[PDB]
């Protein structure tokens, strides 16, 4: 894979540890741009990172924190973007790799040998006990000439001394002992006020728009661009989706155009992403951008004609941009909600809260809210859930969560330490983006039993799991599908929860024959669903009752027959 | 004031080596990229090598690349160019030159006087001395010539002063010319007026350093 | 390999002109990043090394007087002097510092056209310390001459000596822009003790005819 997605979980211990390796192996593996924050945390000494090996680039920031493991291997990171910053300020940060309390564990050397570039923010090292050569490296080289106010925070306490570099580098500066460790300068050595460079000679300065360095003067040989790569070659600015014309000023559409994502100009946008007026793929859209789907192919976003006409939002999302979950007082914001904007979220606080006090739990029958609801935009996290409830049949008819805002940015549906007995998401059928962990739900049994496949989108996708009723023991107690669940599919158990309905549907459930030619009112077949005919249609003997719904396509009227229509 | 003063330069038999060393007084060496450039006899410039303030930085010709190892020591203010495997094509003078501003730069903006290498497996052989006796045959009105030709010596070259350097008006040493033998020989020669021939003395010094051959040489006139 | 090409290799000039020298670079020597080429010009007066005259293709060093000025961009330069002095006289060359390998141009010899000046004709036979050592070198002086160009013969009792006489002659003096010529005749002791009159003809643009300067073997 070229691309893949990072993640925002910042220093906080994952709910459970067991997964979280999986969970960074399925998220950056094969991967060379993360695009995100590349967050390696609470990561034990033995811990196989090899996964890491092809990343050149990071968007965000470098967060490498409580980490028993001896090295990590970011040996081909060439640059840091700093889209975002940790702790405000700091585009890497390697905090609390020690031992605390083989032989030691805890981060010796960096090995950041091809870590040329630091766009935007400072560095932050501290508390690590047998980090060496932190000291040796010129940061003041690292960071781009722009930001260099990029203060530097590094604490160099050990717990053993270190050897020297390897004699072969030119001052002392090295990620390691090892020769092929030496830090390569590329800013501070150039001639004139040079960009970066190869070489401390004028041939050897590198295009405006390269970045990490270059092998070369063109804007081709870039080690990677400031700006854009534009099929090859680094630019300040994609290629517009649009001409304009001499005099008239109309959308003349540009056949070499492109849309700019992340930091490449692109045909078309990526699977979950919206394109935008503007020729961006994002994944909110821009302010007075109105969410459309067109019927061309994904949906983008547009400059609406009036104020645009406001559709539910969620969390993380305009008036409920830091509410952290649904509660009692926001319940009833959901009501008659077709599509939500934003995400949801169900803590103990929404339903055991009466903390900042007077805010009265929410019931179970509030839930009801959300049968109306079909689509999340962002992301579904369920921490806790009433007893009462056996599943979450309230989102019966969710289809699709798109998760293109996830939990921690990873996860779109997680559900960790609930007590309901099967699933019941009946009409989900697809995950946009993101991981999905079910955890801890000691009841939950109907998990096995989901084809999690066909929900995903792309290959970094996984369901992750642990610690719920296992299939063996449910299956001991004898819970397999029901019998007309195609291809034993099913999200609980019952008639109801199968996936696809193998032989007829009557809204709900899944049924073996309509009422065609006997019961009680009789029904015509339509996309395999019985629906009834009119009611004042008569009653046949082995015969078909109507063609379709209404009363003028009975065979015979029951009472009265008065054309165009049975009464 | 700035100076550059090289050493180590002389005959070497073809496949041989030396060591040519540049010594730098009256700047802060540490902080200024030192080069060596040569030129053949009678030719342009070539840019031989060059070396970065604090030696993180080296280049070579493709001519001489191998063959050539630039160094320095800034605790002793010296420039050093072991120079192996030499060819006819190396023998040339090699001027030592301080750059500008460390590695960035290569202005060469001081420049030594500069050291001459041969490179030929004839020997050496110093010179011999004999004076241009005057020419009392030109006008006592009037103006008279003299001088010293030095002959059949190599390698090159040799330094050839008037009265230990205190006549030098009116003065032409010539070039060395090259001879059959494969000796160079050497006339110098001096312009003063006719009527202080009697009265005043006249004597060149000849210094051929390769052979250690010093000679200071008294010229008069012939009479009958 | 940024390739350096001067034009001309020849200048002569009357000091008070002004007089110009090109380089040509087969790679362009601009440099973005701080706006200017990466050109540098050396005058190497003669029994000298080098001296730098500009960097940056325009800017001059300390010292160097206000006649000299760069010109130029790209590829293509003017190195210019308006008022030549006596004392210029040297070859000038133009080196790049753009990139490896650092590469100078051919040179360019400038010489200060001086009024029509005759040779001073001196002779001088063998001494007689050398003529036992078992050669006899005669020398013929020409001094302080302008122009360059000139004859010289040498005859050995009428007999035009040619192939065995080696010729010198002085760069071009920084004072008085004369040149000076040795030319150095070569016999054996044998040959040397066979002939009475030796002799020595110059022809020159400064003379009204050829002149000669001739000792008779043994005769005061
Ligand atoms: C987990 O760590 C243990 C202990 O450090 C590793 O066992 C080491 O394996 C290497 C490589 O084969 C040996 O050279 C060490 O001497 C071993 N050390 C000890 C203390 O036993 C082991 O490789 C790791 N185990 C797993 C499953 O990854
Ligand atoms: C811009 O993107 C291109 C891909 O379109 C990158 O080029 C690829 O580099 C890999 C790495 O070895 C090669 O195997 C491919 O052959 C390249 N593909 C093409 C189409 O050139 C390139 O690295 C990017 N450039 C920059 C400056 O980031
Ligand atoms: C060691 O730790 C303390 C506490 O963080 C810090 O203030 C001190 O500066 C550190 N020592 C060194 C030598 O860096």
């Given at each position: 894979?070229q691309?893949?997605?990072?993640?925002?979980?910042?220093?906080?211990?994952?709910?459970?540890?067991?997964?979280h390796?999986?969970?960074?192996?399925?998220?950056?593996?094969?991967?060379?741009?993360?695009?995100?924050?590349?967050?390696?945390?609470?990561?034990?000494?033995?811990?196989?990172?090899?996964?890491?090996?092809?990343?050149?680039?990071?968007?965000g920031?470098?967060?490498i924190?409580?980490?028993?493991?001896?090295?990590?291997?970011?040996?081909?990171?060439?640059?840091?973007?700093?889209?975002?910053?940790?702790?405000?300020?700091?585009?890497?940060?390697?905090?609390?790799?020690?031992?605390?309390?083989?032989?030691?564990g805890?981060?010796?050397?960096?090995?950041?040998?091809?870590?040329?570039?630091?766009?935007?923010?400072?560095?932050?090292?501290?508390?690590?006990?047998?980090?060496?050569?932190?000291?040796?490296?010129?940061?003041?080289?690292?960071?781009?000439?722009?930001n260099?106010?990029?203060?530097?925070?590094?604490?160099?306490?050990?717990?053993?001394?270190?050897?020297?570099?390897?004699?072969?580098?030119?001052?002392?500066?090295?990620?390691?002992?090892?020769?092929?460790?030496?830090?390569?300068?590329?800013?501070?050595?150039?001639?004139?006020?040079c960009?970066?460079?190869?070489?401390?000679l004028?041939?050897?300065?590198?295009?405006?728009?390269?970045?990490?360095?270059?092998?070369?003067?063109?804007?081709?040989?870039?080690?990677?661009?400031?700006?854009?790569?534009?099929?090859?070659?680094?630019?300040?600015?994609?290629?517009?989706?649009?001409?304009?014309?001499?005099?008239?000023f109309?959308?003349?559409?540009?056949?070499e155009?492109?849309?700019?994502?992340?930091?490449?100009?692109?045909?078309?946008?990526?699977?979950?992403?919206?394109?935008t007026?503007?020729?961006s793929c994002?994944?909110?859209?821009?302010?007075?951008?109105?969410?459309?789907?067109?019927?061309?192919?994904?949906?983008?976003?547009?400059?609406?004609?009036?104020?645009?006409?406001?559709?539910?939002?969620?969390?993380?999302?305009?008036?409920?941009?830091?509410?952290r979950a649904?509660?009692?007082?926001?319940?009833?914001?959901?009501?008659?909600?077709?599509?939500?904007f934003?995400?949801?979220?169900?803590?103990?606080?929404?339903?055991?809260?009466?903390?900042?006090?007077?805010?009265?739990?929410?019931?179970?029958?509030?839930?009801?809210?959300?049968?109306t609801?079909?689509?999340?935009?962002?992301?579904?996290?369920?921490?806790?859930?009433?007893?009462?409830?056996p599943?979450?049949?309230?989102?019966?008819?969710?289809?699709?969560?798109?998760g293109?805002?996830?939990?921690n940015?990873?996860?779109?549906?997680?559900?960790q330490?609930?007590?309901?007995?099967?699933?019941?998401?009946?009409?989900?059928?697809?995950?946009?983006?993101?991981?999905?962990?079910?955890?801890?739900?000691?009841?939950?049994?109907?998990?096995?039993?989901?084809?999690?496949?066909?929900?995903?989108?792309?290959?970094?996708?996984?369901?992750?799991?642990?610690?719920?009723?296992?299939?063996?023991?449910?299956?001991?107690?004898?819970?397999?599908?029901?019998?007309?669940?195609?291809?034993?599919?099913?999200?609980?158990?019952?008639?109801?929860?199968?996936?696809?309905?193998?032989?007829?549907?009557?809204?709900?459930?899944?049924?073996?024959?309509?009422r065609?030619?006997?019961?009680?009112?009789?029904?015509?077949?339509?996309?395999?669903?019985?629906?009834?005919?009119?009611?004042?249609?008569?009653?046949?003997?082995?015969?078909?009752?109507?063609?379709?719904?209404?009363?003028?396509?009975?065979v015979?009227?029951?009472?009265?027959?008065?054309?165009?229509?049975?009464? | 004031?700035?100076?550059?003063?090289?050493?180590?330069?002389?005959?070497?038999?073809?496949?041989?080596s030396?060591?040519?060393?540049?010594?730098?007084?009256?700047?802060?060496?540490?902080?200024?990229?030192?080069?060596?450039?040569?030129?053949?006899?009678?030719?342009?410039?070539?840019?031989?090598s060059?070396?970065?303030?604090?030696s993180?930085?080296?280049?070579?010709?493709?001519?001489?690349?191998?063959?050539?190892?630039?160094?320095?020591?800034?605790?002793?203010?010296?420039?050093?160019?072991?120079m192996?495997?030499?060819?006819?094509?190396?023998?040339?003078?090699?001027?030592?030159?301080?750059?500008?501003?460390?590695?960035?730069?290569?202005?060469?903006?001081?420049?030594?006087?500069?050291?001459?290498?041969?490179?030929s497996?004839?020997?050496?052989?110093?010179?011999?001395?004999?004076?241009?006796?005057?020419?009392?045959?030109?006008?006592?009105?009037?103006?008279?010539?003299?001088?010293?030709?030095?002959?059949?010596?190599?390698p090159?070259?040799?330094?050839?002063?008037?009265?230990?350097?205190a006549?030098?008006?009116?003065?032409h040493?010539?070039?060395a010319?090259?001879?059959?033998?494969?000796?160079?020989?050497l006339?110098?020669?001096?312009?003063?007026?006719?009527?202080?021939?009697?009265?005043?003395?006249?004597?060149?010094?000849?210094?051929?350093?390769?052979?250690?051959?010093?000679?200071?040489?008294?010229?008069?006139?012939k009479?009958? | 390999?940024?390739?350096?090409?001067?034009t001309?290799?020849?200048?002569?000039?009357?000091?008070?002109?002004?007089?110009?020298?090109?380089?040509?670079?087969?790679?362009?020597?601009?440099?973005?990043?701080?706006?200017?080429?990466?050109?540098?010009?050396?005058?190497?007066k003669?029994g000298?090394?080098?001296?730098?005259?500009?960097?940056?293709?325009?800017?001059?060093?300390?010292?160097?007087?206000?006649?000299?000025?760069?010109?130029?961009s790209?590829?293509?330069?003017?190195?210019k002097?308006?008022?030549?002095?006596?004392?210029?006289?040297?070859?000038?060359?133009?080196?790049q510092?753009?990139?490896?390998?650092?590469?100078?141009?051919?040179g360019?010899?400038?010489?200060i056209?001086?009024?029509?000046?005759?040779?001073?004709?001196?002779?001088?036979?063998?001494?007689?310390?050398?003529?036992?050592?078992?050669?006899?070198?005669?020398?013929?002086?020409?001094?302080?001459?302008?122009?360059?160009?000139?004859?010289?013969?040498?005859?050995?009792?009428?007999?035009?000596?040619?192939?065995?006489?080696?010729?010198?002659?002085?760069?071009?003096?920084?004072k008085?822009?004369?040149?000076?010529?040795?030319?150095?005749?070569?016999?054996?002791?044998?040959?040397?003790?066979?002939?009475?009159?030796?002799?020595?003809?110059?022809?020159?643009?400064?003379?009204?005819?050829?002149?000669?300067?001739?000792?008779?073997?043994?005769?005061?």
């Amino acid at each position: 894979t070229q691309v893949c997605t990072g993640t925002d979980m910042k220093l906080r211990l994952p709910a459970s540890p067991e997964t979280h390796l999986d969970m960074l192996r399925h998220l950056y593996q094969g991967c060379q741009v993360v695009q995100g924050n590349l967050e390696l945390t609470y990561l034990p000494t033995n811990a196989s990172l090899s996964f890491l090996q092809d990343i050149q680039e990071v968007q965000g920031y470098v967060l490498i924190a409580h980490n028993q493991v001896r090295q990590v291997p970011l040996q081909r990171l060439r640059i840091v973007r700093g889209t975002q910053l940790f702790e405000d300020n700091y585009a890497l940060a390697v905090l609390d790799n020690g031992d605390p309390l083989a032989s030691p564990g805890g981060l010796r050397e960096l090995q950041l040998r091809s870590l040329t570039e630091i766009l935007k923010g400072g560095v932050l090292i501290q508390r690590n006990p047998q980090l060496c050569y932190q000291d040796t490296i010129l940061w003041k080289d690292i960071f781009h000439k722009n930001n260099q106010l990029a203060l530097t925070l590094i604490d160099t306490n050990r717990s053993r001394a270190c050897h020297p570099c390897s004699p072969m580098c030119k001052g002392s500066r090295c990620w390691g002992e090892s020769s092929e460790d030496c830090q390569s300068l590329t800013r501070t050595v150039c001639a004139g006020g040079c960009a970066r460079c190869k070489g401390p000679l004028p041939t050897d300065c590198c295009h405006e728009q390269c970045a990490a360095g270059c092998t070369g003067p063109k804007h081709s040989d870039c080690l990677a661009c400031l700006h854009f790569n534009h099929s090859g070659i680094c630019e300040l600015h994609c290629p517009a989706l649009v001409t304009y014309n001499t005099d008239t000023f109309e959308s003349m559409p540009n056949p070499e155009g492109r849309y700019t994502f992340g930091a490449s100009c692109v045909t078309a946008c990526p699977y979950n992403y919206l394109s935008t007026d503007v020729g961006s793929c994002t994944l909110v859209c821009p302010l007075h951008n109105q969410e459309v789907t067109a019927e061309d192919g994904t949906q983008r976003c547009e400059k609406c004609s009036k104020p645009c006409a406001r559709v539910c939002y969620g969390l993380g999302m305009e008036h409920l941009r830091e509410v952290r979950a649904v509660t009692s007082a926001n319940i009833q914001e959901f009501a008659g909600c077709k599509k939500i904007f934003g995400s949801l979220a169900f803590l103990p606080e929404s339903f055991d809260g009466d903390p900042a006090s007077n805010t009265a739990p929410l019931q179970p029958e509030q839930l009801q809210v959300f049968e109306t609801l079909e689509e999340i935009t962002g992301y579904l996290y369920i921490s806790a859930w009433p007893d009462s409830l056996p599943d979450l049949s309230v989102f019966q008819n969710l289809q699709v969560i798109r998760g293109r805002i996830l939990h921690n940015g990873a996860y779109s549906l997680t559900l960790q330490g609930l007590g309901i007995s099967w699933l019941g998401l009946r009409s989900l059928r697809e995950l946009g983006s993101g991981l999905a962990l079910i955890h801890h739900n000691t009841h939950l049994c109907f998990v096995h039993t989901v084809p999690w496949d066909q929900l995903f989108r792309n290959p970094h996708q996984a369901l992750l799991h642990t610690a719920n009723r296992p299939e063996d023991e449910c299956v001991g107690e004898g819970l397999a599908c029901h019998q007309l669940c195609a291809r034993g599919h099913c999200w609980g158990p019952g008639p109801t929860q199968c996936v696809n309905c193998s032989q007829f549907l009557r809204g709900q459930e899944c049924v073996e024959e309509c009422r065609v030619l006997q019961g009680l009112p009789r029904e015509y077949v339509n996309a395999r669903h019985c629906l009834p005919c009119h009611p004042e249609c008569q009653p046949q003997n082995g015969s078909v009752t109507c063609f379709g719904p209404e009363a003028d396509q009975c065979v015979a009227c029951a009472h009265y027959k008065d054309p165009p229509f049975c009464v | 004031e700035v100076q550059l003063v090289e050493s180590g330069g002389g005959l070497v038999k073809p496949g041989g080596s030396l060591r040519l060393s540049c010594a730098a007084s009256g700047f802060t060496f540490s902080s200024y990229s030192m080069s060596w450039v040569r030129q053949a006899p009678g030719k342009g410039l070539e840019w031989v090598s060059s070396i970065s303030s604090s030696s993180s930085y080296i280049y070579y010709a493709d001519s001489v690349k191998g063959r050539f190892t630039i160094s320095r020591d800034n605790a002793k203010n010296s420039l050093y160019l072991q120079m192996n495997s030499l060819r006819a094509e190396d023998t040339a003078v090699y001027y030592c030159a301080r750059g500008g501003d460390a590695y960035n730069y290569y202005y060469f903006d001081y420049w030594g006087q500069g050291t001459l290498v041969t490179v030929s497996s004839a020997s050496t052989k110093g010179p011999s001395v004999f004076p241009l006796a005057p020419s009392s045959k030109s006008t006592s009105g009037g103006t008279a010539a003299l001088g010293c030709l030095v002959k059949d010596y190599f390698p090159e070259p040799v330094t050839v002063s008037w009265n230990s350097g205190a006549l030098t008006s009116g003065v032409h040493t010539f070039p060395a010319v090259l001879q059959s033998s494969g000796l160079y020989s050497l006339s110098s020669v001096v312009t003063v007026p006719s009527s202080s021939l009697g009265t005043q003395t006249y004597i060149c010094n000849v210094n051929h350093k390769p052979s250690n051959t010093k000679v200071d040489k008294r010229v008069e006139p012939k009479s009958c | 390999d940024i390739v350096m090409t001067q034009t001309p290799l020849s200048l002569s000039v009357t000091p008070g002109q002004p007089a110009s020298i090109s380089c040509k670079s087969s790679q362009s020597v601009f440099f973005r990043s701080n706006n200017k080429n990466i050109l540098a010009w050396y005058l190497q007066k003669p029994g000298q090394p080098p001296q730098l005259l500009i960097y940056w293709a325009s800017s001059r060093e300390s010292g160097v007087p206000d006649r000299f000025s760069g010109s130029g961009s790209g590829t293509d330069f003017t190195l210019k002097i308006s008022r030549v002095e006596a004392e210029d006289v040297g070859v000038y060359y133009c080196q790049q510092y753009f990139g490896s390998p650092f590469t100078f141009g051919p040179g360019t010899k400038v010489d200060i056209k001086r009024t029509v000046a005759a040779p001073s004709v001196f002779i001088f036979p063998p001494s007689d310390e050398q003529l036992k050592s078992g050669t006899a070198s005669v020398v013929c002086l020409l001094n302080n001459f302008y122009p360059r160009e000139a004859k010289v013969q040498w005859k050995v009792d009428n007999a035009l000596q040619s192939g065995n006489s080696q010729e010198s002659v002085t760069e071009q003096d920084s004072k008085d822009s004369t040149y000076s010529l040795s030319s150095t005749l070569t016999l054996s002791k044998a040959d040397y003790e066979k002939h009475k009159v030796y002799a020595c003809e110059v022809t020159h643009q400064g003379l009204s005819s050829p002149v000669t300067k001739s000792f008779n073997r043994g005769e005061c």
